[model samples]
Target: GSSGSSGEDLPLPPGWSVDWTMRGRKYYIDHNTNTTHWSHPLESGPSSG
Candidate 1:
């Protein structure tokens, strides 16, 4: 999960972003605004789990 802000404010029009906090920061994954990316911490645990 993100420690900064909630994803509720994230752009949902397929906004694209790179996740740098995945797998000890070893992986960079692309995330769309509306869809969830598995590598994203927000999508991997707690909220998504």
Candidate 2:
């Protein structure tokens, strides 16, 4: 994992940054699509929280 400086305006470590437009991963909208895309098990059971 990468670490950052605590103070504002301070530079991050090498190859590090603070991009506002950056985003995390996104999943498909439909359950079937997500299951297919994520290789999830399609059984009728309670999914873990």
Candidate 3:
């Protein structure tokens, strides 16, 4: 069985990170200085976390 749309792990610089799990995947909400990115996911579907 195929999972959903999954994201790859991105190289992160020095920053504050938060891991959020949704559905059946893991997401990273990273922030540093004036930038933030939602990168990394085990599986993807909706934002029903």
Candidate 4:
């Protein structure tokens, strides 16, 4: 969601985060460090020869 990055200034415990996909985009909620990130789909790796 667009508010995924909200409340980032708050503190978070260790080993906490959320991941999801929306509208072909990826979202990340990092609670360990209290941060977040969003990006396009990740690469699937190299193709067969």
Candidate 5:
């Protein structure tokens, strides 16, 4: 999840983005660097309160 911002405003790195998995999970990626992340790239626990 994105910190400070809510909803689809995840603080992904520049050129990065996120998507929902087949199981309704979150997946992240950096299209410019070809890097991938299975979790939020800039935040810690506590996505939703």
Candidate 6:
């Protein structure tokens, strides 16, 4: 559900980018920290209401 200048992409944050796997599993990259994670960085921690 993303549309980018490169390939048409994510609601992605400014620096973060779209990185889809061979199987089309879309993850993300935090360019500020240069790290990639399958889990949404915004979705951190297990504690939630």
lDDT against true structure, model 6 = 0.65
lDDT (0 to 1) per candidate: 0.41, 0.29, 0.46, 0.43, 0.68, 0.65
On lDDT, the candidate that comes out on top is 5
Best by TM-score: 6
> By the lDDT metric, which is better: model 2 or model 3?
3
Instruction: Assess the local accuracy of residue 18 in candidate 4 as a C-alpha lDDT between 0 and 100.
Output: 44
Residues 11-35, candidate 1: write the lDDT tens digits: 3223345455645442323453344
**lDDT tens digits, residues 1-49, model 6?**
5454333243456688767899987778889899997766555652423
lDDT per residue for candidate 5 within 14-36, as digits (tens), equals: 68888887898677887987887
The ten-residue window of minimal lDDT in model 4 covers 40-49
Q: Candidate 3, residues 1-49: lDDT per residue as tens digits?
A: 4354354443433554546566654545545444433544223342434
lDDT of 4 by residue, 1-49 (tens): 6676443432223454546566554455656556665531121231322
Candidates arranged by TM-score, highest first: 6, 5, 3, 4, 2, 1
Clashes of each: 0, 0, 0, 0, 0, 3
Steric clash pairs (candidate 3): none
Give one digit per residue, the lDDT tens place, for model 2 in 1-49. Answer: 4453322333322332333223643222233333222211222231533
Model 1 regions lying over 4 Å from their true place: 1-14, 22-35, 39-49
**In model 6, where do residues sit more than 4 Å from their true spots?**
1-11, 45-49
Ranking the candidates on lDDT from highest down gives: 5, 6, 3, 4, 1, 2
Error of 2 at 7 (Å): 5.9
C-alpha positional error of residue 30 in candidate 5 after TM-score superposition, expressed in Å: 0.9
Residue 40 C-alpha lDDT in model 2: 15
Pairs in steric clash, model 1: none
**Model 1 TM-score, 2 decimals:** 0.20
Clashing pairs in 4: none
